[PDB]
Amino acid sequence: KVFERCELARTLKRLGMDGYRGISLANWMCLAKWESGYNTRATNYNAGDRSTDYGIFQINSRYWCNDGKTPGAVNACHLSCSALLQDNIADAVACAKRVVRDPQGIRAWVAWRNRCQNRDVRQYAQGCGV
Template sequence: MKALIILGLLLLSVAVQGKVFERCELARTLKELGLDGYKGVSLANWLCLTRWESDYNTKATNYNPSSESTDYGIFQINSKWWCDDGKTPNAVDGCHNIHHSHAAAAAKSLQSCQTLSLRLYFPLVAWKSHCRDHDVSSYVEGCSL
C-alpha cells in the first residue's frame, strides 16, 4: 500500500502540470517507487497498463457516455468507482473524493484511501485486452533498469 500511496502522490502532483512520460523514464520511476513485483505484478505489466490506458500521459481523460463517468490520469482512474469528480451521477467514490485538479487535497485523500489496491488497476479493459496472458517484456526492454 505504501508504494501505491507514494506512486499516487507523485502522479497526482505531476497530473496538475501534466506530463507525458517516456517509456523508460516511467519504468525507472515505477521501479524506484517499489512497484516492480508489488503484489506479484511485474514492472512490465505496469508499463503495459499505462501504455494502453493513457499512453503514459498523466493528464489523459476519457469520457464514458454509457456510465456518464470519466477516466482520469495515467492509470485512467474512473470517477464512478474511485474518484467522485462532482460531475458523475451515482459515483461511489472509493477514495474519498480524490479531485485530480487539486493535487494537495487529492494526495491527502489518497493517503486515507484503504481501498486503493491492484483491484483498481488490473481489472481495466486495456490491461485485459493488451497485457494479460501476453509477453509484456518488451515494455521494459532497453531501459537499463
C-alpha cells in the same frame, strides 16, 4: 506530461510498483501504454454511464476518485480526480495501488485483458535499467 518509456519505468520502480500485489513492472508499463500512451493529462468521458477516466492509468470516477458530476459514485482513493491529472504521478500510483487491492487485481482494467494478459510484455520495460 507525456513520459518517455524508460523514464516512466524508472519512476514506477522507485514508487514501489514492481511486484505490487504480484504485478510485475512490465505489466504496469503495458497498462499505462494502452490506457493513455504514458500521458498524465489524458481524460476520457464515457457517455454511456456519465463517468470519466483520468490520467496515466485512466482511473474511473465511478469508484476511485471524486469529480462531483458522476452519478452514484464513490471515492475509494479519497482523492479529487484533479489529483490524477498532475505531472507528478505519486497520487495516481497510490490510487492505482488501491485499485489492485480489490479481488480483480490488474484485471480491473479491460485494456489490460485485451492487450497485456497472456502476452510477452517484457518489451515495455526492457533496456531501462530497472
